[PDB]
């Protein structure tokens, strides 16, 4: 169990829009055995009160799917909660409002990092900072996995949607 | 067609309910219980 300082004065309104997941550094079974089958993962952020409405588009067997979740607030600005065995703690520590975004997730005493960007390509300095942070997070370089830079879903359908909320 | 299936030609293990029902089968010819067995477990089994 670890906890760091989130982004100072995080604004969900200025953070809204379409985000694109680039790299995720962690030690998970799907990341190490099925990491070669990863695809383009995009994110959609929509503010809802203190919480954050979250939509995720990703190609599963070619057909796109919509993952709708609601990151419940933990009472502290910057930190969020998500529920399904396990508790997810979303922590945003270092990000701007125009080019990149870094997220921290915790589950079952395991830490994980996520790199989000508004568009491709990603700046080399952002990737260097992400590598430095994932190395400071007691994670090795081999646990870093890059994602394709194309094939992002435009929009899903009523049938292809997730209903965690 | 999605998958191929084949049962072993010999040395197979039978179900315990079918085991007990066959142990309950008589020796003298009685079409009633044999017809009940046919109605409860079918007339054949799946080899392929």
């Amino acid at each position: 169990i670890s906890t760091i300082q989130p982004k100072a004065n995080f604004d969900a309104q200025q953070f809204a829009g379409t985000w694109l997941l680039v790299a995720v550094g962690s030690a998970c079974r799907f990341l190490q055995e099925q990491g070669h089958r990863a695809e383009a993962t995009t994110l959609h952020v929509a503010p809802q009160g203190t919480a954050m409405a979250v939509s995720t588009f990703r190609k599963l067997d070619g057909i796109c799917w919509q993952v709708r979740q609601l990151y419940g607030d933990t009472g502290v600005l910057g930190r969020f909660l998500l529920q399904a065995r396990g508790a997810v703690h979303v922590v945003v520590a270092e990000t701007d409002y125009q080019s990149f975004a870094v997220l921290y997730l915790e589950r079952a005493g395991q830490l994980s990092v996520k790199l989000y960007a508004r568009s491709l390509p990603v700046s080399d300095s952002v990737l260097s900072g992400f590598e430095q942070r994932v190395q400071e997070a007691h994670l090795t370089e081999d646990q870093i996995f890059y994602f394709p830079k194309y094939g992002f879903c435009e929009a899903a359908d009523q049938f292809h949607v997730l209903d965690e909320v | 067609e999605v998958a191929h299936y084949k049962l072993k030609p010999r040395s197979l293990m039978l179900h315990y309910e079918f085991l007990q029902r066959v142990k309950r089968l008589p020796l003298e010819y009685s079409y009633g219980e044999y017809r009940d067995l046919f109605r409860d477990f079918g007339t054949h089994y799946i080899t392929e």
Partner: protein
Amino acid sequence: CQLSNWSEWTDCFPCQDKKYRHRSLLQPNKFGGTICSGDIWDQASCSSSTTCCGQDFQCKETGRCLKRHLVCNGDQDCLDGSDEDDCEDVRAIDEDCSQYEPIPGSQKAALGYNILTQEDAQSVYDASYYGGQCETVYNGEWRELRYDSTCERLYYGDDEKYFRKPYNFLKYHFEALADTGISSEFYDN
């Protein structure tokens, strides 16, 4: 509504300790006849009780005949609980069987049926009786949904894929068939 007279009082029962009588329904309300609030059945208290399986074991209040191999096995076979009582020094195996739930829909299969009203009667078969047997049938709905944000993993929910079969059920016959037919008739004269 025309109802006959009350029948003669039947003999008192030792265990029930009640009286009974009934009558017949001669003429119901066809068009405008006056209805009869009174029913054809009745009961009465009695005070003439006199005296109130033979197999390996029997429940205390219910006459369910149970073998001794089902006593102290981690499964309540009697509603009163006479099978899992005083089982102090008895090991109870789990078999990885009590974690999974029985087949959905046994309630309707355990109910009776009345062809006159097309309604469901009380429980007929015991939908919770297993008799120590643990049979599992592979379900077909093991593809619903599951997501993992921390691992970025999308796959089918692998929590519950097993259906337990009660003793009173022969087989659940997991299969799949579909026949859809629409009929259309357009005539003009």
